Design an enzyme around this catalytic site. Sequence first.
Site, short mmCIF file in Angstrom:
data_model
loop_
_atom_site.label_atom_id
_atom_site.label_comp_id
_atom_site.label_asym_id
_atom_site.label_seq_id
_atom_site.Cartn_x
_atom_site.Cartn_y
_atom_site.Cartn_z
N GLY A 23 22.04 -38.56 5.71
CA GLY A 23 22.73 -38.55 6.99
C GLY A 23 22.40 -37.32 7.79
O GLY A 23 22.07 -36.27 7.23
N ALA A 26 26.35 -33.62 13.52
CA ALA A 26 26.84 -32.29 13.91
C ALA A 26 26.92 -31.38 12.69
O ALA A 26 26.60 -30.20 12.79
CB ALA A 26 28.20 -32.41 14.58
N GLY A 28 24.98 -31.25 10.27
CA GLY A 28 23.62 -30.86 9.95
C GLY A 28 22.92 -32.00 9.24
O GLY A 28 22.95 -33.14 9.72
N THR A 29 22.33 -31.71 8.09
CA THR A 29 21.64 -32.74 7.32
C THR A 29 22.14 -32.79 5.88
O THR A 29 22.36 -31.75 5.25
CB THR A 29 20.11 -32.57 7.45
N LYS A 49 24.04 -30.37 1.42
CA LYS A 49 24.36 -30.14 2.82
C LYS A 49 23.71 -28.87 3.34
O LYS A 49 23.93 -27.80 2.79
CB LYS A 49 25.89 -30.09 3.04
N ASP A 141 41.85 -34.78 9.03
CA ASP A 141 40.75 -35.64 9.49
C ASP A 141 40.54 -36.90 8.62
O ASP A 141 39.40 -37.30 8.36
CB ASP A 141 39.43 -34.84 9.66
N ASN A 146 35.41 -40.83 6.33
CA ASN A 146 35.59 -39.68 5.44
C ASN A 146 36.03 -40.06 4.03
O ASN A 146 36.46 -39.20 3.26
CB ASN A 146 36.54 -38.67 6.06
N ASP A 159 35.54 -34.28 3.51
CA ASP A 159 35.58 -33.60 4.80
C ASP A 159 36.80 -32.67 4.90
O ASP A 159 37.86 -33.06 5.40
CB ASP A 159 35.45 -34.58 5.99
C1 4ZH Z 1 25.21 -41.61 4.04
C2 4ZH Z 1 25.70 -40.77 2.88
N1 4ZH Z 1 25.34 -41.00 1.65
C3 4ZH Z 1 25.90 -40.09 0.81
C4 4ZH Z 1 25.86 -39.85 -0.57
N2 4ZH Z 1 26.55 -38.86 -1.12
C5 4ZH Z 1 27.31 -38.03 -0.41
N3 4ZH Z 1 28.01 -37.00 -1.10
C6 4ZH Z 1 29.05 -36.26 -0.57
C7 4ZH Z 1 30.08 -35.69 -1.35
C8 4ZH Z 1 31.10 -35.00 -0.67
N4 4ZH Z 1 31.07 -34.88 0.68
C9 4ZH Z 1 30.09 -35.47 1.37
O1 4ZH Z 1 29.88 -35.34 2.70
C10 4ZH Z 1 30.87 -35.52 3.69
C11 4ZH Z 1 30.38 -34.83 4.96
C12 4ZH Z 1 29.29 -35.64 5.66
C13 4ZH Z 1 31.62 -34.87 5.85
S1 4ZH Z 1 29.81 -33.11 4.65
C14 4ZH Z 1 28.21 -33.20 3.83
O2 4ZH Z 1 29.62 -32.48 5.90
O3 4ZH Z 1 30.66 -32.46 3.71
N5 4ZH Z 1 29.10 -36.10 0.75
C15 4ZH Z 1 27.37 -38.18 0.99
C16 4ZH Z 1 26.68 -39.23 1.61
N6 4ZH Z 1 26.54 -39.67 2.91
C17 4ZH Z 1 27.18 -38.99 4.05
C18 4ZH Z 1 26.28 -38.14 4.95
C19 4ZH Z 1 28.40 -39.66 4.66
#
Ligand code: 4ZH
Length: 303
Positions: A23, A26, A28-29, A49, A141, A146, A159
């Site tokens: 993903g 905002a 980032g990546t 992240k 949020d 999320n 999040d």
């Molecule tokens: C499409 C996609 N596939 C994913 C696989 N694994 C995770 N792992 C995790 C674990 C905890 N938190 C998050 O990310 C939530 C966000 C996008 C809010 S973050 C990276 O800004 O903390 N991802 C996130 C993933 N995504 C996002 C970008 C929604």
Amino acid sequence: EAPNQALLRILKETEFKKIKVLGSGAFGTVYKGLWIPEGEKVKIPVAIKELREATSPKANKEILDEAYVMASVDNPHVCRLLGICLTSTVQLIMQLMPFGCLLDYVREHKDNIGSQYLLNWCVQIAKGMNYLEDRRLVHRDLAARNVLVKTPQHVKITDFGRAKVPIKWMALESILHRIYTHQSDVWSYGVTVWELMTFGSKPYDGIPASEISSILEKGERLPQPPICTIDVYMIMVKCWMIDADSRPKFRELIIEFSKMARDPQRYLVIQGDERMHLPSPTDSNFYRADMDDVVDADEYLIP
Ligand SMILES: Cc1nc2cnc(Nc3ccnc(OCC(C)(C)S(C)(=O)=O)n3)cc2n1C(C)C
């Protein structure tokens, strides 16, 4: 008042590899990756992240406040921080949630989502939120975007960049007075349930954000999704009461949705419900879709 004794694990850049972009926004990546510790004969699927623009001291501060919150939680229905890597930019190492966010998941797989999954997801989100409440942490949020999918049968809340503006998920006291409580999270939980029950519809679609406050004050709420019995809809409606204390508590939501999860077809009416199936470890090539010595973060070096 209680000391926060959470452990902040510093991980070496050399121990993990970025595979592909998951993903980009905002935030980032986010990269899909593999974490291969020191010499432990394990491969952990991870999500990495890293901020898209600059190496500003303001960016580093914001990502480190998020790391502090993510490292301080430990619950099966909440996303925990695995570690941080101290590169110039600083990156967060999190658990890979292979099926992405629940919002995109319900949109893409609506034809195979039965009442059992929907009600079980409502139980899991309420368990995570009840955990956050016991930890005195207000999410601020909560939305279907999320909630991440580890497996179709296991979801976790993420999040914490706001945990101590998404107007269409906010409680009335939040829009009008900036009051955020565990009861304002209950309102958001109501909108999240609505999102799931409509298989990913946009709440108040077409209506501009500045009109929401006035609409809510008039008494207008999100409509009854066609699959919802009055039992499920009444719960959603109770999450959207003006009086925050009249709203259900997360522990009550766990109980209510669990009772319903026992006879799901009595509470959600879905055409062809019983003939619906989603991937599970029962599937041939469930994990298949270097695969040797890989273990999930939930089973590795448990806190
Ligand atoms: C499409 C996609 N596939 C994913 C696989 N694994 C995770 N792992 C995790 C674990 C905890 N938190 C998050 O990310 C939530 C966000 C996008 C809010 S973050 C990276 O800004 O903390 N991802 C996130 C993933 N995504 C996002 C970008 C929604």
